Amino acid sequence: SALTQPASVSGSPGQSITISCTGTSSDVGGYNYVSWYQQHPGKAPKLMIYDVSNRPSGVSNRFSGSKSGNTASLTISGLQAEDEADYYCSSYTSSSTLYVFGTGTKVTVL
Amino acid sequence: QVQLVESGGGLVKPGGSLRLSCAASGFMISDSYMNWIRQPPGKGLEWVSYISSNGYAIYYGDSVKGRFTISRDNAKNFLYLQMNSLRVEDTAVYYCAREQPGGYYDSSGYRLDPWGQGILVTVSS
Amino acid sequence: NLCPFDEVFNATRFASVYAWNRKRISNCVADYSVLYNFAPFFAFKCYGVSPTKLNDLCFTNVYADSFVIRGNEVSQIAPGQTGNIADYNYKLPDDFTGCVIAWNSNKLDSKVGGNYNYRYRLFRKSNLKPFERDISTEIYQAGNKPCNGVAGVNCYFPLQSYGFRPTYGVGHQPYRVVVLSFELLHAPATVCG
């Protein structure tokens, strides 16, 4: 039981990106508790968003989460440079395992 | 503000054991639900275990079941996770993270907010 | 100045029965028309008042207690009824007035293998007066100074886990519950609307 998160994306400052994160009908769809964390190489992953629409402190409005059925999808606007980092979609389930994670996305800017 | 520093990891031989200590600073570890996250080198993240506030609810990862005991030192205010009878596939970095909505009237979904610095373990000859 | 109703019913994590939580809500305009939204509302009943008339009167001080109990014991939470959920766990008075609300939530409190997070005192020396909660840790006796840390034929641990599983019969799945209690001595009106 793991979420399927895509490989990688690429764009220049000013473009905008989306990232898909699918799942089953027990972890993502049916609970809508998915969250998203970011990790630069060499730092503990830091919380980016949770509760989808709930953006936490400090985060640039440039991130926009959304959940449709089973799929979840992030959309980041105003392509910058710091975007160079891994992004993991995580979720809380109801069988064994109270949290799963996505394969991981590498976001690189051209 | 609130730090989660780790200590106790490093190199080991296969079959042996080791113990990781998670020290919380900036707040009280005796009332914050905790849980460990393991990440192999060059892969994603994976769940390890979880302690509750009660101390009476303990949930292990399905793979670390049967080994990898967990506990808390509410006297020394740390968390301890002893990995016992390790194998070659467990080499990874480990993070000690706390669930944010640890209050009693949160009406807010869970999220691991305070992250750990993380320490590595390597299992081979 | 509305009242925080959708902040206690929308709570993310409840307390266990034996250490139930109380919260005072006052100095605000309370409306009981929004409560119908959440859950199937397996039980919503009042003693001393009728809900259709409840949106009108003003009260002295209304309290709210929340906890989680099994699904075959919901009946035990009633004025002056005997059983095992209102003898040593938590008890309400025989002259109670107010309302009770419960909704089986087996989708957020039951994991696979038994959710061992909510317990209740099975052994108590003497029953309890209304609206008192006991958190004192003590081992039951066995015709001798009770085992100081151990368990024999008797000398069992006071608290027993529920172990909720997602396959039980309806009467064994957990049920979130909340109780409203208020005086109507027409004391200085503090809440209505």
Numbering used by the authors:
A (entry chain A): 2 to 111
B (entry chain C): 1 to 125
C (entry chain B): 334 to 526
Can you quote the paper on this entry?
Elite nAbs, mainly derived from the IGHV2–5 and IGHV3-66/53 germlines, showed potent neutralizing activity across Wuhan-Hu-1, Delta, Omicron sublineages BA.1 and BA.2 at picomolar NT50 values. In this study, we used single-cell sequencing technology to isolate hundreds of monoclonal antibodies from convalescent patients of BA.1 breakthrough infection and identified dozens of elite antibodies with NT50 values at the picomolar level. To further analyze the molecular basis for these elite nAbs, we determined the structure of Fab in complex with Omicron BA.4/5 S-trimers by cryo-EM combined with X-ray crystallography. Next, we evaluated the epitopes of these elite antibodies and found that these antibodies mainly fall into two distinct groups, which was consistent with the results of the epitope competition assay.
Group 1 is represented by TH003, TH027, TH236, and TH272. These antibodies, which are similar to the IGHV2–5 germline-derived LY-CoV140415 and XGv26526, target the conserved solvent-exposed outer face of the SARS-CoV-2 RBD without directly blocking the binding of ACE2 and can be categorized into the RBD-5 community. TH236 contains a longer HCDR3 with 19 amino acids and forms a larger hydrogen bond network with RBD, mainly contributed by Y33, E99, P101, Y104, Y105, S107, and S108 with E340, N343, T345, R346, F347, A348, and N354 from the SARS-CoV-2 RBD.
